[PDB]
Structure formats: C-alpha cells, structure tokens
Amino acid sequence: DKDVKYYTLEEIKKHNHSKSTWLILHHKVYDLTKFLEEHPGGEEVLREQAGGDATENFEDVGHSTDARELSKTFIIGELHPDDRSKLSKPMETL
Numbered sequence: 001d002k003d004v005k006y007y008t009l010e011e012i013k014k015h016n017h018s019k020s021t022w023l024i025l026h027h028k029v030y031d032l033t034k035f036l037e038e039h040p041g042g043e044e045v046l047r048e049q050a051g052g053d054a055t056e057n058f059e060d061v062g063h064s065t066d067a068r069e070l071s072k073t074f075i076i077g078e079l080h081p082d083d084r085s086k087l088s089k090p091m092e093t094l
C-alpha cells in the first residue's frame with residue numbers, strides 16, 4: 001500500500017470497521033486491514049486503536065525493524081496538512 005492520500009481526522013475515524021482497520025502512528029495514516037490476521041502477535045490490538053493513536057502501543061513494545069518496514073507499505077495517507085500543525089480553522093462555503 002504505497003501512496004499518501006492526505007486524509008482528514010474524520011476520515012480516519014470513519015474506517016474503524018474491520019475491512020478498513022486504519023490507525024494513526026506518528027502523524028501518519030496506516031491501514032493494517034490485510035495485516036490484521038497477517039500480524040505476528042494479534043489483530044484485535046490493531047482494532048483497540050483503530051482510527052486512533054496506536055503509537056503508545058507501537059512504542060510501549062518498541063517494535064522490531066521488520067515491523068518498522070511493513071509500516072512503509074501500510075501507509076495509505078497522512079494527516080491533512082491543514083490539520084498537522086493547527087487543527088483549528090473554520091470551513092466556509094460559497
């Protein structure tokens with residue numbers, strides 16, 4: 001999974017189902033849906049932080065390098081650039 005489709009926080013918080021198990025690991029949007037059962041450890045752990053900050057876990061365990069790699073193929077997007085260093089503005093329409 002190799003692209004950066006800049007997604008909005010709402011979007012990430014709208015993929016927490018089962019076939020879109022996303023999460024935010026270091027201001028980045030990952031997708032481990034096809035990795036849920038393909039993850040050496042569990043799957044439900046990726047759901048406990050689905051569309052949410054699993055970074056606490058990722059670091060608590062202090063993951064191996066081979067895992068740091070699948071991260072690169074699990075990114076599907078990044079936190080919007082209007083929402084990386086602000087997260088505080090209106091929208092306005094017409």
Ligand code: HEM
Pocket residue numbers: 025030032039040041042045046048049054055057058061063064066067068069070071074
């Ligand atoms: C980029 C996303 C992730 C990738 C690519 C990934 C990949 C891996 C790999 C390759 C291992 C090593 C297997 C072993 O030690 O036998 C591992 C272990 C593990 N992972 Fe992940 N992982 C990811 C995210 C997560 C997250 C967010 C959680 C928790 C919510 C988690 C919890 C664990 C646990 C519990 C283990 C077993 C070893 C231990 O921590 O004692 N992983 N992971």
